[PDB]
Design an enzyme around this catalytic site. Structure first.
Site, PDB file in Angstrom:
ATOM      1  CB  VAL A 104       5.483   2.901   3.756  1.00 56.16           C
ATOM      2  CG1 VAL A 104       5.932   4.153   4.512  1.00 56.16           C
ATOM      3  CG2 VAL A 104       6.694   2.141   3.246  1.00 56.16           C
ATOM      4  N   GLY A 105       2.639   1.386   3.355  1.00 54.69           N
ATOM      5  CA  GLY A 105       1.827   0.585   2.421  1.00 54.69           C
ATOM      6  C   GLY A 105       1.020  -0.612   2.927  1.00 54.69           C
ATOM      7  CE1 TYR A 158       3.610   0.621  -2.774  1.00 55.01           C
ATOM      8  CE2 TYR A 158       3.888   1.340  -0.481  1.00 55.01           C
ATOM      9  CZ  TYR A 158       3.379   1.542  -1.732  1.00 55.01           C
ATOM     10  OH  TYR A 158       2.652   2.686  -1.865  1.00 55.01           O
ATOM     11  CB  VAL A 171       8.731  -1.548   2.556  1.00 52.82           C
ATOM     12  CG1 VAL A 171       9.332  -0.212   2.114  1.00 52.82           C
ATOM     13  CG2 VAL A 171       9.106  -2.639   1.556  1.00 52.82           C
ATOM     14  CG  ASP A 194       8.203  -6.312 -10.701  1.00 52.79           C
ATOM     15  OD1 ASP A 194       7.201  -6.369  -9.991  1.00 52.79           O
ATOM     16  OD2 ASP A 194       8.351  -7.017 -11.680  1.00 52.79           O
TER      17      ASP A 194
HETATM   18  C1  LIG Z   1      10.528  -7.918  -5.315  1.00 56.79           C
HETATM   19  C2  LIG Z   1       9.976  -8.690  -6.436  1.00 56.79           C
HETATM   20  C3  LIG Z   1      10.809  -8.666  -7.717  1.00 56.79           C
HETATM   21  C4  LIG Z   1       9.862  -9.138  -8.827  1.00 56.79           C
HETATM   22  C5  LIG Z   1      10.573  -9.433 -10.112  1.00 56.79           C
HETATM   23  N1  LIG Z   1      11.313  -7.318  -7.996  1.00 56.79           N
HETATM   24  C6  LIG Z   1      12.594  -7.046  -8.250  1.00 56.79           C
HETATM   25  O1  LIG Z   1      13.455  -7.898  -8.359  1.00 56.79           O
HETATM   26  C7  LIG Z   1      12.971  -5.586  -8.405  1.00 56.79           C
HETATM   27  C8  LIG Z   1      14.384  -5.568  -8.951  1.00 56.79           C
HETATM   28  C9  LIG Z   1      14.808  -4.658 -10.061  1.00 56.79           C
HETATM   29  C10 LIG Z   1      13.775  -4.385 -11.184  1.00 56.79           C
HETATM   30  C11 LIG Z   1      14.187  -5.064 -12.492  1.00 56.79           C
HETATM   31  C12 LIG Z   1      13.348  -4.628 -13.686  1.00 56.79           C
HETATM   32  C13 LIG Z   1      13.357  -3.127 -13.841  1.00 56.79           C
HETATM   33  C14 LIG Z   1      12.839  -2.466 -12.592  1.00 56.79           C
HETATM   34  C15 LIG Z   1      13.663  -2.876 -11.378  1.00 56.79           C
HETATM   35  N2  LIG Z   1      12.891  -4.879  -7.140  1.00 56.79           N
HETATM   36  C16 LIG Z   1      12.360  -3.657  -7.010  1.00 56.79           C
HETATM   37  O2  LIG Z   1      11.924  -3.016  -7.967  1.00 56.79           O
HETATM   38  C17 LIG Z   1      12.347  -3.058  -5.638  1.00 56.79           C
HETATM   39  C18 LIG Z   1      11.466  -2.014  -5.412  1.00 56.79           C
HETATM   40  C19 LIG Z   1      11.458  -1.350  -4.204  1.00 56.79           C
HETATM   41  C20 LIG Z   1      12.335  -1.706  -3.183  1.00 56.79           C
HETATM   42  C21 LIG Z   1      12.364  -0.964  -1.864  1.00 56.79           C
HETATM   43  N3  LIG Z   1      11.665   0.313  -1.880  1.00 56.79           N
HETATM   44  C22 LIG Z   1      10.361   0.420  -1.635  1.00 56.79           C
HETATM   45  O3  LIG Z   1       9.643  -0.543  -1.355  1.00 56.79           O
HETATM   46  C23 LIG Z   1       9.782   1.765  -1.799  1.00 56.79           C
HETATM   47  C24 LIG Z   1      10.344   2.938  -2.337  1.00 56.79           C
HETATM   48  N4  LIG Z   1       9.468   3.919  -2.437  1.00 56.79           N
HETATM   49  N5  LIG Z   1       8.300   3.385  -1.956  1.00 56.79           N
HETATM   50  C25 LIG Z   1       7.102   4.158  -2.072  1.00 56.79           C
HETATM   51  C26 LIG Z   1       6.589   4.445  -3.332  1.00 56.79           C
HETATM   52  C27 LIG Z   1       5.415   5.172  -3.443  1.00 56.79           C
HETATM   53  C28 LIG Z   1       4.750   5.604  -2.310  1.00 56.79           C
HETATM   54  C29 LIG Z   1       5.262   5.317  -1.058  1.00 56.79           C
HETATM   55  C30 LIG Z   1       6.439   4.598  -0.931  1.00 56.79           C
HETATM   56  C31 LIG Z   1       8.459   2.100  -1.545  1.00 56.79           C
HETATM   57  N6  LIG Z   1       7.484   1.353  -1.019  1.00 56.79           N
HETATM   58  C32 LIG Z   1      13.203  -2.751  -3.403  1.00 56.79           C
HETATM   59  C33 LIG Z   1      13.219  -3.425  -4.609  1.00 56.79           C
END
Ligand SMILES: CCC(CC)NC(=O)[C@H](CCC1CCCCC1)NC(=O)c1ccc(CNC(=O)c2cnn(-c3ccccc3)c2N)cc1
Length: 341
Positions: free
Chosen positions: A26-27, A31, A34, A164
């Site tokens: 996806v994407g 992203y 993924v 994020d």
């Molecule tokens: C990776 C880089 C890093 C930069 C700092 N960030 C993180 O550490 C944060 C960790 C937690 C954070 C902390 C702050 C609050 C928010 C969450 N990490 C995530 O947020 C994080 C986010 C996502 C994922 C795996 N999931 C996907 O990819 C996903 C899910 N739905 N969809 C989707 C969305 C819209 C349409 C179609 C599909 C995706 N593509 C796994 C980790």
């Protein structure tokens, strides 16, 4: 240990438990690496992220550990959470790949504003959910720092989660002036500045401060909020920063009612409280939840805080194999969330 199966997708080897079926990327890389998948234990669609070169350097190794720690912590309706974490490895020695499983979200806000200008009710509900998740994150002493519409995901029911995706929508457009500039005197309310910029864009259909760079960005900001007064100038410790600010021809704060013309005055009032230059006077997430604009959603008995989060690792300088070992520990100790749905 469950039974894994192997396949390849768009340049990459994927080895995942039989539990997860029908992987589809996806994407297009937007992203990470993924896949959408079907989870046979719940019958729900999920997203599976395979980390790219998680232990390639001390820096990658630490980032990997950090992401896993943060994800394992997050247990709230409006924040992404961890459904599962696995690796095909049987031992630390073999440990080289980390897969993260989360809910699959429907669309980001970049898409949803780039569709329409939302109704005031939709704006109320989306910003209320952002602030509720932020109250939670902030209560664990965690700062998001990169809030922007592509980091918020919304499903068809308008339920919102903060995430994020990491590195169209520039971060600088949503970033608080104090960490555009000095990155010295800043609190959790850098995230509230971002929520003000997001909310403006939802209300109007236009990026509030679409600067070309850090200087231009700041110019656009000061044109709305006005140049710092002596009280804010008193608290800038950077001489170069202070020299630059005072070098500009002085500008008055605009009346936000004449900028966001036709908006709900309660929305306008809240924006005045979010987009203040002085970070010590900016409204917090907990205060913003009690603002009259959210009267229809606000329930003080249903805006929980987080458990404390041990960030003490952030100040450590360790070797790759040490960050790797820690990350393995965390994979091993993972306790999945309740199935009940
Ligand atoms: C990776 C880089 C890093 C930069 C700092 N960030 C993180 O550490 C944060 C960790 C937690 C954070 C902390 C702050 C609050 C928010 C969450 N990490 C995530 O947020 C994080 C986010 C996502 C994922 C795996 N999931 C996907 O990819 C996903 C899910 N739905 N969809 C989707 C969305 C819209 C349409 C179609 C599909 C995706 N593509 C796994 C980790």
């Amino acid at each position: 240990r469950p039974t894994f199966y192997r396949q390849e997708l768009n340049k990459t080897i994927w080895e995942v438990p039989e539990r997860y079926q029908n992987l589809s990327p996806v994407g297009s890389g937007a992203y990470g690496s993924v896949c959408a998948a079907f989870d046979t234990k719940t019958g729900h669609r999920v997203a599976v992220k395979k980390l790219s070169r998680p232990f390639q350097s001390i820096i990658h190794a630490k980032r990997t550990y950090r992401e896993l720690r943060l994800l394992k912590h997050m247990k709230h309706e409006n924040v992404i959470g961890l459904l599962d974490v696995f690796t095909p490895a049987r031992s630390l020695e073999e440990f080289n790949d980390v897969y993260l499983v989360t809910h699959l979200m429907g669309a980001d806000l970049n898409n949803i504003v780039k569709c329409q200008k939302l109704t005031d009710d939709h704006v109320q509900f989306l910003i209320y959910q952002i602030l509720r998740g932020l109250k939670y994150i902030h209560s664990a002493d965690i700062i998001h720092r990169d809030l922007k519409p592509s980091n918020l995901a919304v499903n068809e029911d308008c339920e919102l989660k903060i995430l994020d995706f990491g590195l169209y929508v520039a971060t600088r457009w949503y970033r608080a002036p104090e960490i555009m500039l000095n990155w010295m005197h800043y609190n959790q309310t850098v995230d509230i500045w971002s929520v003000g910029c997001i909310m403006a864009e939802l209300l109007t259909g236009r990026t509030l401060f679409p600067g070309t760079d850090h200087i231009d960005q700041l110019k656009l900001i000061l044109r709305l909020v006005g140049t710092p007064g002596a009280e804010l100038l008193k608290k800038i410790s950077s001489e170069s920063a202070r020299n630059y600010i005072q070098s500009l021809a002085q500008m008055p704060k605009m009346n936000f009612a004449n900028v966001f013309i036709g908006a709900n005055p309660l929305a306008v009032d809240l924006l005045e409280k979010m987009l203040v230059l002085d970070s010590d006077k900016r409204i917090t997430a907990a205060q913003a939840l009690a603002h009259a604009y959210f009267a229809q959603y606000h329930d003080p008995d249903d805006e929980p805080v987080a458990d404390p989060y041990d960030q003490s690792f952030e100040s450590r300088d360790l070797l790759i194999d040490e960050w790797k070992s820690l990350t393995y520990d965390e994979v091993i100790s993972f306790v999945p969330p309740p199935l009940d749905q």
